[PDB]
Paper text:
GCs exert their effects by binding to the GC receptor (GR), a ubiquitously expressed nuclear receptor that drives both the activation and repression of its target genes. GR is normally sequestered in the cytoplasm and binding of GCs to its ligand-binding domain causes GR to translocate to the nucleus, where its DNA-binding domain (DBD) binds canonical activating GC response elements, or (+)GREs, which are pseudo-palindromic hexameric sequences containing two AGAACA (or similar) half-sites separated by 3 bp. Here we demonstrate that GR binds directly to κBREs and propose that direct GR–DNA interaction at these genomic loci are an important mechanism to repress the expression of pro-inflammatory genes. Taken together, our results demonstrate that GR binds a conserved, cryptic sequence within a subset of κBREs to repress pro-inflammatory transcription.
Using X-ray crystallography, we solved five crystal structures of the GR DBD bound to κBREs from the CCL2, ICAM1, IL8, PLAU, and RELB promoters, at resolutions ranging from 1.85 to 2.30 Å. However, in all structures, one DBD monomer was consistently located above the end-stacking junction of the pseudo-continuous DNA helix formed by crystal packing. An interesting feature of the five crystal structures in complex with κBREs is the common binding footprint for the central GR DBD monomer. Through the side chains of Lys442, Val443, and Arg447, the GR DBD makes contacts with four of the five bases within the AATTY motif. Arg447 recognizes the first two bases of this sequence: its guanidino group makes van der Waals contacts with the first adenine and a terminal amine forms a hydrogen bond with the second adenine in the motif. Val443 participates in a van der Waals interaction with the C7 of the thymine in the central A:T base pair; this distance is constant across the five crystal structures (3.8–4.3 Å).
Numbering used by the authors:
A (entry chain B): 419 to 490
B (entry chain A): 418 to 490
Amino acid sequence: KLCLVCSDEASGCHYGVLTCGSCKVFFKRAVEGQHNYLCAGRNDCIIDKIRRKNCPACRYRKCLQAGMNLEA
Amino acid sequence: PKLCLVCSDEASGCHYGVLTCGSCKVFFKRAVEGQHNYLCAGRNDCIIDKIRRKNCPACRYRKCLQAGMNLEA
DNA sequence: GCTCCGGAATTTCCAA
DNA sequence: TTGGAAATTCCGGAGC
Ligand SMILES: [Zn+2]
Ligand SMILES: [Zn+2]
Ligand SMILES: [Zn+2]
Ligand SMILES: [Zn+2]
């Protein structure tokens, strides 16, 4: 039932991956925002429920290598 | 010149005992009266600057305390 | 007249 | 939206 990104509960499978609501209003506007997103860490930041908003960079990263894309 | 000891932006003036910008001033003020409960998603060495400073409240708050910031000064 | 600082009130911002 | 946190702006009072 877990979002494969933030490990909150999934609202369904969107963009080819099972994840949550916020994680699926997030990928989302990073792509056609085509955003910068610099990490203040090592690029290995932990992504979970209340930390997910700390590092958009690592969050966006983890989105991609879970396979999220705009296509179907 | 004139540059903040915390978020590394240009300093409004000495605030709470530490030369700092205005952003960190009201950040620190808000942190001490409220809760600290912030978590770091990194190793607690996170880099703080104008773009990065909003990423990790935890590390930013730590730097303020490290800098010597205190409410009565 | 000014400088300096705390700080409240206001606006900007964005996540959920 | 609905509400919380960020940040710029502005005012009160101690000084000088
Ligand atoms: Zn998620
Ligand atoms: Zn990161
Ligand atoms: Zn600062
Ligand atoms: Zn951190």
